Amino acid sequence: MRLNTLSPAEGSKKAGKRLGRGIGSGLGKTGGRGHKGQKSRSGGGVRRGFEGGQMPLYRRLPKFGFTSRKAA
């Protein structure tokens, strides 16, 4: 038991993805984003619930019920 002898348990520390650092890594160039499109752009991607322009599920279905206040 010395400060240069302690070791973490196996599996506790995983490394972490580093994108854009060469071919050998497997995440070089595009960095896992594919080619072009909105999802490849910095800060790109659509908001939660967006399904294209199709009326989303949470707006296609009717609202129902009321909150009690006595239940609280």
Find residue 53's DSSP bridge partners: 51
The nearer residue to RNA, 60 or 70, going by C-beta atoms, is 60
Comparison of 9 and 23: residue with beta carbon closer to Mg ion: 23
Only one of the segments 1-9, 36-44, 60-68 lies at the binding site for RNA (rule: CB under 7 A); that segment is: 36-44
CB of 9 to RNA, least distance (A): 19
Q: What's the 3-state SS for 1-39?
A: CCCCCCCCCCCCCCCCCCCCCCCCCCCCCCCCCCCCCHH
- In this complex, which beta carbon is closest to Mg ion, that of residue 37 or of residue 62? 37
Ordered DSSP codes for 50-68: -BTBSPPHHHHSPP-----
Binding region for RNA (CB under 7 A): 18-26, 28-31, 36-40, 45-46, 50-54
